[PDB]
Amino acid sequence: SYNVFPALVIITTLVVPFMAAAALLFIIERD
Amino acid sequence: GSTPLFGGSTGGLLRKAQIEEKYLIVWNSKEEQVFEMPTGGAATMVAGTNVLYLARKEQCHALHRQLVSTFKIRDSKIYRVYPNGEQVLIFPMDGVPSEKSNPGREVVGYVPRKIGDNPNPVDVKFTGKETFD
């Protein structure tokens, strides 16, 4: 009844923000 | 001409002066004398033609203002130097100083109205046209 997916916390709060920041870096610095 | 006597500083040229543009100011001096660098610190101008590389046009025009106000040196010339090596004279443009009126210049930026007769911003909506036209 403690229902969490810790890997979903790691992915959505660590991994994809760093990858969105990398993606946003490519958007704002290209050309 | 030669560089003024200066031991170097940290307030001078950066990589912009290698890749984009730097500036050259040329003046003649009759007496060897000490002036303040716009970079910071004191230098001595030679008794001859002086050439000095500076980072901005404003630093060159500040030295020209110092050379006029303090040393009565009038004939300063400012060049824009491109990284390929091209020099383009930028000051003074037509040989006559800017404050004195000269027949031969074109009027640039003239708006044939007083400032309160500019149109409203709603008049120029959805265009790149500005109200100072």
Binding site: - | H61, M93, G109, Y110, V111, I115
Partner: protein, 80 residues
């Protein structure tokens, strides 16, 4: 680059030209005032937008106007 406009109220006092630290401005001959001259802004790609010219202008409301526009390396005043 900033836009530096000169309006028809200019009395040709040349004070904006002397005030400008970038030599943006100059006097051309005119007929609209007793001095026979008017400020002009041929070199606004060097204009930094400091508005020292507007400070020097004596006419009620001013005959020279700086409109801050697109920023360049020159207009941001960068030595780097």
């Amino acid at each position: 680059s900033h836009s530096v406009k000169i309006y028809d109220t200019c009395i040709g006092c040349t004070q904006c030209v002397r005030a400008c630290p970038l030599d943006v401005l100059e006097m051309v001959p005119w007929d609209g005032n007793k001095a026979g001259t008017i400020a002009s802004s041929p070199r606004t790609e060097d204009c930094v937008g400091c508005k020292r010219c507007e400070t020097a202008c004596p006419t009620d409301f001013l005959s020279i106007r700086v409109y801050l526009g697109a920023e360049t390396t020159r207009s941001m005043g960068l030595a780097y």
